[PDB]
Structure 1
Amino acid sequence: GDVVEAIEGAVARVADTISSGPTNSQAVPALTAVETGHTSQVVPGDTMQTRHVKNYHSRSESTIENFLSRSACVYMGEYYTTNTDETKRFASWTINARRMVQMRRKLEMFTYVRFDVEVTFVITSKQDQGTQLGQDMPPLTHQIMYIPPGGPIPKSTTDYAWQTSTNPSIFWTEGNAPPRMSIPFVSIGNAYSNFYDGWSHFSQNGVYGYNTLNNMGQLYMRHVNGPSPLPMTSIVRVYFKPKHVKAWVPRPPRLCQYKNASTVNFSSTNITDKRDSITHVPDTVKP
């Protein structure tokens, strides 16, 4: 265990099919009571005769780790390299996984989650359209600064805040692998809250919901080369991959379409899609 430490294979199959013959008894597994809030633990061997089937299937891809540990876009932000307006040459983002809908819906399948993140950036520049497009610009380097809540916010691309003496920053020049770094679980509580039924103020007013507990800081992005002779746009895409995941209190998957990121507001949604009648099963065997 000094140089090498083995690890036993945690392999977990699904349950087998046990063989069941004919029955005539006072045992009634198909008869239960949903009124108890209890899901019936009936297997197929109770309601019909079954052969023995040795099952080798596994539930490894429905584990919470394997279900959530996928990189997913959380933000897409544009910023220019030259522009008369200065707040256009850099990008801000208040960190939250609520603006891209897929990862938000995946995370909101649980009430509480606790995990580390792997943040990857996909930065991509393009030359804006114009009368002249000929130029020779060296590779674009980008700075992504993580400003935790309370630190100084930059006002330009030449601000002192970009000195990043303590804030963590990534410098990355175009043409290389995407930048990627890890983030521990950085909540002030014992888990992140996808939902906060409550208020910010004890007077039961102010802000309602996710935003009161949600303050992880912001991300600022700029070019370091300075302005180009001709306008160029960099789009930075942010990808979160949670790892070492733990989840509590699963919720029914969001049925309605998300409206904004501040709230859970929704338009009223049908339960499902209509069919022709209650007995409608369309014929599939026909000439």
Structure 2
Amino acid sequence: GDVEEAIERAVVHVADTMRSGPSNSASVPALTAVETGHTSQVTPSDTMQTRHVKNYHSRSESTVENFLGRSACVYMEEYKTTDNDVNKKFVAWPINTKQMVQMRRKLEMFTYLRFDMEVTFVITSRQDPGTTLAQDMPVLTHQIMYVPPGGPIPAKVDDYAWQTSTNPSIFWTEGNAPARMSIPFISIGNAYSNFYDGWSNFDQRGSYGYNTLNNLGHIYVRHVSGSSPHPITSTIRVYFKPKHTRAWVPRPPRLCQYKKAFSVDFTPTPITDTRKDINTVTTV
């Protein structure tokens, strides 16, 4: 009514070590058949004498919610306040999570993912170097607009599309706390796919790979009415923080360095690094 008792007063720990003494039996825990595709459930008490240890360690920091739940930079680009080239004055980004290596490797440890998304923007501006820099420009305001697939796309900073009568936009002024908002799980499927071993056409032709399922739309950003006498360059950095996460069918982590944003493509890389012989255990 007023207060509610969702208290988790009983939290999970790591397994205790049971005291274990000598044995002489036909029962043999240490011998198994790896061939079954089974990982052994052996513990020290099975193969040696152990003392009792009340273990209070907890796996709290390794839940998928926690592992994925930190904001990571997924994109960055610059847009000028004034320039002769129309395209240098605004950013148009096709939303995806494959261009920044760190976030990509983490998400890619799972095949399917389902989560809500917290998006934070970090926008900074700097005056371009030049011969004459004296000016007195008022504070800048930026507009970030999300255009769902199929909506009208802006062709220049001053076009009608920026009216956002229906698309969601954020107007933010410099000097303030970074802009932020939440987006729910928006896939047309039941989970987001990090990989897709298939084609776009029924023919088994067309696009191949996860890129065929990426149609989340674009993010467009411009200065509001910020034309300055001497150019100023703003850089926008977008951060993603998944929350209320669920993950399915885990995969080996990416070993080879990434080469392309929209394909699994790689260059063969060795299993691991080498040492002189199979018995080398020293450093020098």
Corresponding residue SS for 1:212: helix
**Cross-structure match for 1:8:** 7
**Aligned mates of 1:112, 1:178 — CA distance in 2:** 30
Matched letter for residue 223 of structure 2:
H
CA offset at residue 4 of structure 1?
Answer: 0.7
How many percent identity over aligned positions?
Answer: 73
CA RMSD between the two structures: 0.9
**Cross-structure match for 2:58:** 58
**Cross-structure match for 1:136:** 136
Matched letter for residue 220 of structure 1:
Y
**Cross-structure match for 2:251:** 251
CA offset at residue 218 of structure 1?
Answer: 0.3
Corresponding residue SS for 2:178: coil
| CA offset digits 1:125-184 (Å, max 9, x no partner) | 111110011111011100000000000000000110000000000000100000000000
**Aligned mates of 1:63, 1:50 — CA distance in 2:** 29
Corresponding residue SS for 1:277: coil
Matched letter for residue 269 of structure 1:
T
Matched letter for residue 7 of structure 2:
E
| Residue 167 (structure 1) aligned with residue 188 (structure 2) | no
Matched letter for residue 34 of structure 1:
V
Query: Do 2:154 and 2:161's aligned partners in 1 also have CA atoms closer than 8 Å?
Result: yes
**Aligned mates of 2:29, 2:201 — CA distance in 1:** 52
| CA offset digits 1:49-102 (Å, max 9, x no partner) | 000000000001100000000000000011111001111100011100100000
Matched letter for residue 8 of structure 1:
I
**Aligned mates of 1:118, 1:23 — CA distance in 2:** 56
**Aligned mates of 1:221, 1:96 — CA distance in 2:** 16
Unmatched tracts of structure 2, length 5 or more: none
Matched letter for residue 110 of structure 1:
F
CA offset at residue 25 of structure 1?
Answer: 0.4
**Cross-structure match for 1:268:** 268
Matched letter for residue 248 of structure 1:
W
**Aligned mates of 2:67, 2:171 — CA distance in 1:** 31
**Aligned mates of 2:29, 2:282 — CA distance in 1:** 32
**Aligned mates of 1:278, 1:92 — CA distance in 2:** 54
Corresponding residue SS for 2:124: strand
**Cross-structure match for 1:89:** 89
**Aligned mates of 2:170, 2:112 — CA distance in 1:** 30
**Cross-structure match for 2:220:** 220
**Aligned mates of 2:123, 2:225 — CA distance in 1:** 15
Unmatched tracts of structure 1, length 5 or more: none
Number of residue pairs matched by the alignment: 283
**Cross-structure match for 2:201:** 201
Matched letter for residue 74 of structure 2:
V
**Aligned mates of 1:283, 1:116 — CA distance in 2:** 47
**Cross-structure match for 1:25:** 25
**Cross-structure match for 1:182:** 182
Corresponding residue SS for 2:86: coil
CA offset at residue 225 of structure 1?
Answer: 2.2
TM-score, scaled to structure 1: 0.97
**Cross-structure match for 2:75:** 75
CA offset at residue 30 of structure 1?
Answer: 0.6
CA offset at residue 227 of structure 1?
Answer: 1.3
Query: Do 2:140 and 2:226's aligned partners in 1 also have CA atoms closer than 8 Å?
Result: no
CA offset at residue 276 of structure 1?
Answer: 1.4
**Aligned mates of 2:281, 2:38 — CA distance in 1:** 31
CA offset at residue 283 of structure 1?
Answer: 6.6
Matched letter for residue 89 of structure 1:
K
**Aligned mates of 1:47, 1:225 — CA distance in 2:** 74
Q: 1:283 to 1:102 in 2, by over 3 A?
A: closer
| CA offset digits 1:100-119 (Å, max 9, x no partner) | 00000000000000000100
Matched letter for residue 6 of structure 1:
E
**Aligned mates of 1:23, 1:124 — CA distance in 2:** 69
